[PDB]
Design an enzyme around this catalytic site. Structure first.
Site, PDB file in Angstrom:
ATOM      1  N   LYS A 166       0.092 -17.397   7.578  1.00  0.00           N
ATOM      2  CA  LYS A 166       1.007 -16.610   8.396  1.00  0.00           C
ATOM      3  C   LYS A 166       1.894 -17.466   9.297  1.00  0.00           C
ATOM      4  CE  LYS A 166      -1.283 -12.294   8.262  1.00  0.00           C
ATOM      5  NZ  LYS A 166      -2.064 -11.243   8.926  1.00  0.00           N
TER       6      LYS A 166
ATOM      7  N   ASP B 125     -11.849 -17.326   9.493  1.00  0.00           N
ATOM      8  CA  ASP B 125     -10.560 -16.917   8.987  1.00  0.00           C
ATOM      9  C   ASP B 125      -9.596 -16.751  10.139  1.00  0.00           C
ATOM     10  OD1 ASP B 125      -8.360 -15.774   7.935  1.00  0.00           O
ATOM     11  OD2 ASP B 125      -9.421 -14.300   6.740  1.00  0.00           O
TER      12      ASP B 125
ATOM     13  N   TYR C  24       0.812  -1.223   0.000  1.00  0.00           N
ATOM     14  CA  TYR C  24       0.000   0.000   0.000  1.00  0.00           C
ATOM     15  C   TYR C  24       0.835   1.258   0.000  1.00  0.00           C
ATOM     16  CZ  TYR C  24      -4.705  -1.812   0.455  1.00  0.00           C
ATOM     17  OH  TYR C  24      -5.883  -2.481   0.197  1.00  0.00           O
TER      18      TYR C  24
ATOM     19  N   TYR D 218     -11.048  -7.970   7.623  1.00  0.00           N
ATOM     20  CA  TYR D 218     -10.033  -7.959   6.600  1.00  0.00           C
ATOM     21  C   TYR D 218      -9.686  -9.373   6.256  1.00  0.00           C
ATOM     22  CZ  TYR D 218      -5.748  -7.511   4.027  1.00  0.00           C
ATOM     23  OH  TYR D 218      -4.753  -7.648   3.092  1.00  0.00           O
TER      24      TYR D 218
HETATM   25  C1  LIG Z   1      -7.163 -12.579   8.700  1.00  0.00           C
HETATM   26  C2  LIG Z   1      -6.460 -12.468   7.377  1.00  0.00           C
HETATM   27  N1  LIG Z   1      -6.974 -13.099   6.303  1.00  0.00           N
HETATM   28  C3  LIG Z   1      -6.382 -13.012   5.109  1.00  0.00           C
HETATM   29  C4  LIG Z   1      -5.216 -12.288   4.943  1.00  0.00           C
HETATM   30  C5  LIG Z   1      -4.590 -12.243   3.582  1.00  0.00           C
HETATM   31  O1  LIG Z   1      -3.246 -12.718   3.625  1.00  0.00           O
HETATM   32  P1  LIG Z   1      -2.280 -12.212   2.447  1.00  0.00           P
HETATM   33  O2  LIG Z   1      -0.936 -12.746   2.840  1.00  0.00           O
HETATM   34  O3  LIG Z   1      -2.898 -12.761   1.172  1.00  0.00           O
HETATM   35  O4  LIG Z   1      -2.395 -10.716   2.524  1.00  0.00           O
HETATM   36  C6  LIG Z   1      -4.659 -11.634   6.026  1.00  0.00           C
HETATM   37  C7  LIG Z   1      -3.424 -10.839   5.836  1.00  0.00           C
HETATM   38  N2  LIG Z   1      -3.168  -9.775   6.488  1.00  0.00           N
HETATM   39  N3  LIG Z   1      -2.043  -9.117   6.211  1.00  0.00           N
HETATM   40  C8  LIG Z   1      -1.374  -8.359   7.074  1.00  0.00           C
HETATM   41  O5  LIG Z   1      -1.455  -8.506   8.283  1.00  0.00           O
HETATM   42  C9  LIG Z   1      -0.466  -7.312   6.448  1.00  0.00           C
HETATM   43  S1  LIG Z   1      -0.406  -5.832   7.416  1.00  0.00           S
HETATM   44  C10 LIG Z   1      -1.848  -4.969   7.182  1.00  0.00           C
HETATM   45  C11 LIG Z   1      -2.754  -5.467   6.260  1.00  0.00           C
HETATM   46  C12 LIG Z   1      -3.949  -4.794   6.048  1.00  0.00           C
HETATM   47  C13 LIG Z   1      -4.224  -3.623   6.741  1.00  0.00           C
HETATM   48  C14 LIG Z   1      -3.316  -3.119   7.656  1.00  0.00           C
HETATM   49  C15 LIG Z   1      -2.133  -3.795   7.873  1.00  0.00           C
HETATM   50  N4  LIG Z   1      -1.256  -3.246   8.810  1.00  0.00           N
HETATM   51  O6  LIG Z   1      -0.186  -2.741   8.448  1.00  0.00           O
HETATM   52  O7  LIG Z   1      -1.649  -3.261  10.169  1.00  0.00           O
HETATM   53  C16 LIG Z   1      -5.299 -11.729   7.250  1.00  0.00           C
HETATM   54  O8  LIG Z   1      -4.795 -11.106   8.332  1.00  0.00           O
END
Ligand SMILES: Cc1ncc(COP(=O)(O)O)c(CNNC(=O)CSc2ccccc2[N+](=O)[O-])c1O
Ligand SMILES: Cc1ncc(COP(=O)(O)O)c(CNNC(=O)CSc2ccccc2[N+](=O)[O-])c1O
Ligand code: J4J
Ligand code: J4J
Lengths: 429, 429
Positions: free
Chosen positions: A274, A245, A17, A144
């Site tokens: 993750k 999720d 982003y 999210y």
């Molecule tokens: C609960 C949950 N479900 C799906 C995904 C998607 O995983 P990807 O690896 O495909 O993105 C996630 C992923 N979340 N990503 C992060 O934690 C990146 S930091 C982030 C992301 C979005 C908004 C804000 C922030 N941030 O910097 O706090 C997932 O968590």
């Protein structure tokens, strides 16, 4: 020398982003070990982020490293079509074993978003096979689930600024964000919006999808487990699939191995990622029930229609096996309990700060929500100077350290958070 | 033991496009080296698939292994938000350098589908930023771009069984499959469907997306480069973005470094994956022009709204750098040329088989298209027993060996294919 690198990065490389027009500074990291990131100039940062949840064992873990190097010697990768292998099987054994009983079919994928899209696609194929064209998903606001189009369509319609996508994204159903807190008393009125939506739409809803207990990237909100119990009951009565999720909450971060345990409920579909690989590399898994699995498979399709190229990647499975093997010691429970206690204690003072709107802590998650959005560049710079790596987002200055973080290390983090939040210069008003 | 593993796999583990009720047998691979997969029983299979395109350097490649292990020692992963690192910078430097001149902005992602969705999002944000809500994509029939909802929506609606997704997937525009062959001369009548669709919707099309020259998983089709020249000029005329999905064709497989070079055209957006990492693990890259990057960045979003957790994963980047460094020797050009020569000659006899409808070859790709779908289980069993790993698909028996395959090894593959198409027991009529 590395200033030429940073210049190339600034000019050519997107980060999550970010703008290519006016990118903000990024810090060069050369290595990492235990709970420390090491910059090019050699300065060491205590990691408060776990590289976003996932690096629960910290960095350069000898066991993860050995597990990865061994798999590389066998094969880092081989295709999964018509081929199976020990790391995928072992990983699935571990996943089926550790998850709520009905979850016993594993679809491995490469990323969280893909796991979510796999879950959604499962729900969709399920109802096609049962002859009911259900296509809507019912979810919470402040959700999210990733950045791919399927996942966006169930993310909060404001945060993901779906206004710019409203036209491409199908319109799903969004109940209000769960208001009853997790250190809260439960309030029955909380359920009103969700119930109505269900009532009005129970026939077109393929599945309900939520982050259990912790809505992570959607606001680091921590809501009451009663919500899961009710949604589980509501889903059962309507025969609607429940997609949990747990890509963020999975593998102990909330004090329980899976956040669903806080409510002692089981989803029909469970998304994991993750920390699945101990944050070594990307991998995801979507587990479902035999019932969902057979229904999809006995449909017109005759199969579940998804197959990423690098599906079941042995190296990532091996890393996961190793990561899961470390959690098998059970040491994470006390580690996470201890981090929770220390976070409650040390972030408490921040409640009194004028810039702070709320402080909530659950497992190894510590969140200081502020009244005004943070000044990213300035605050980020401050944190590096404090010798910590803390990555704030909007009005959230939050901590989610590796489980192996030392108390003096955790202390440096909480001290940095407290110090940052006292001062209004790190905020945009 | 392994008989129990296989039983667990069958009972619990999805494979690409598989049924959980009636799964086909899968062969347990314990390791791999050179161009051989080693099954549990010790038998070695000459790999004809490169694990679906990606393993162009074969297996257990020492330089790849050295790079991967070395990078593990530093850090297999660290977050990419506010952080950059040498493996990401090096990989982007290489990618910017080797891809068409206007392409200089790199967005790293984790899988092909995500790269495609990122490309699609770029185009959408592009036009949103210019204040023209263009939302439709024009693609070809027999195209394949992944299994996520966004990527599916530009997949061929027949192969993708879009009858089941027609309702969730927004409806895009599908030109007829490019008919002119690549060893063909160009037939001007080919353009009618494409030109007519373009003319009829040119104001609502955000982007054109195609696999350049070789439409891979959608039918292993090899079409005339004139198509890129024409599509490139028409896109220029309308100001429409051209997305070239080179996730399959990238890095030499068709004889040129990128399949776009066959037409000396440059896309506005370029997707990369698979061979990007030498097929060691999943990673993808979506490159775009600076014009696109800034337009996107100067929109309401103020950024490109995408960021996978494992974005820029150091380990995958390390693998990618290693893979790319191997290609820098230039050895692939001759290797791919030789394989092409050898594929054309040794697959020629298959043309005469009653079961064969077409035989086509390009670079290190050999396609034997049959008149009826292959009998998957039996033919797969046949191939394994002949000591070769060839994974046919529908009416396609194709070879895409690693670039390092030995001539006697390639001969086994082509021999196996010739023998398979002589016998009709391996086909379902
Ligand atoms: C609960 C949950 N479900 C799906 C995904 C998607 O995983 P990807 O690896 O495909 O993105 C996630 C992923 N979340 N990503 C992060 O934690 C990146 S930091 C982030 C992301 C979005 C908004 C804000 C922030 N941030 O910097 O706090 C997932 O968590
Ligand atoms: C050109 C192209 N673009 C995108 C993608 C999506 O990549 P993922 O890594 O997200 O899957 C692909 C993917 N190609 N995958 C394969 O080659 C797997 S085999 C396959 C896939 C689809 C239909 C048939 C077959 N097959 O067994 O031949 C891509 O190629
Ligand atoms: N999207 N992914 C696919 O279409 C994979 S197709 C495939 C791959 C390997 C083995 C068998 C099949 N299949 O079901 O035909
Ligand atoms: N998918 N969403 C994201 O990746 C959000 S991450 C983000 C957002 C705004 C500013 C900076 C970052 N980084 O950290």
């Amino acid at each position: 020398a590395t200033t030429d690198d940073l210049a190339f990065d600034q000019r050519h490389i997107w980060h999550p982003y970010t703008s290519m027009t006016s990118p903000l500074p990024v810090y060069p990291v050369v290595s990492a070990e235990g709970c420390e990131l090491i910059l090019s100039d050699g300065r060491r940062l205590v990691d408060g982020m776990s590289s976003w949840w996932a690096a629960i064992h910290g960095y350069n873990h000898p066991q993860l490293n050995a597990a990865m190097k061994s798999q590389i010697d066998a094969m880092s990768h081989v295709m999964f079509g018509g081929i199976t292998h020990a790391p995928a099987i072992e990983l699935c054994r571990k996943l089926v074993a550790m998850t709520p009983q009905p979850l016993e079919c594993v679809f491995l994928a490469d990323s969280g978003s893909v796991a979510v899209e796999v879950a959604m696609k499962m729900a969709l194929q399920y109802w096609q096979a049962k002859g009911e064209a259900r296509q809507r998903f019912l979810t919470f606001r402040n959700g999210y689930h990733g950045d791919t189009f399927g996942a966006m369509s169930v993310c909060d319609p404001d945060n993901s600024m779906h206004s710019l996508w409203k036209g491409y994204l199908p319109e799903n159903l969004f109940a209000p964000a769960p208001q009853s807190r997790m250190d809260g008393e439960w309030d029955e009125r909380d359920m009103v919006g969700f119930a109505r939506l269900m009532a009005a739409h129970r026939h077109e809803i393929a599945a309900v999808i939520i982050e259990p207990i912790v809505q992570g990237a959607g606001g680091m909100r921590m809501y009451h487990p009663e919500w899961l119990k009710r949604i589980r009951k509501i889903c059962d009565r309507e025969g609607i699939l429940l997609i949990a999720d747990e890509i963020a909450t999975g593998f102990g971060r909330t004090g329980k191995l899976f956040a669903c345990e806080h409510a002692e409920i089981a989803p029909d579909i469970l998304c994991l990622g993750k920390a699945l690989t101990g944050g070594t590399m990307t991998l995801s898994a979507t587990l479902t029930t035999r019932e969902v699995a057979e229904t999809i498979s006995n449909g017109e399709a005759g199969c579940f229609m998804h197959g990423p190229t690098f599906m079941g990647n042995p190296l990532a499975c091996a890393a996961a096996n190793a990561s899961l093997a470390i959690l098998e010691s059970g040491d994470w429970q006390q580690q996470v309990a201890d981090i929770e206690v220390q976070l409650r204690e040390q972030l408490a003072p921040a409640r009194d700060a004028e810039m702070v709107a709320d402080v909530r802590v659950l497992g190894a998650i510590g969140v200081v929500e502020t009244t005004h959005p943070v000044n990213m560049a300035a605050l980020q710079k401050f944190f590096v100077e404090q010798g910590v790596w803390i990555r704030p987002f909007g009005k959230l200055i939050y901590l989610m350290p590796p489980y192996i973080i030392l108390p003096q290390q955790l202390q440096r983090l909480t001290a940095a958070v407290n110090r940052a939040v006292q001062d209004e210069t790190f905020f945009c008003q």
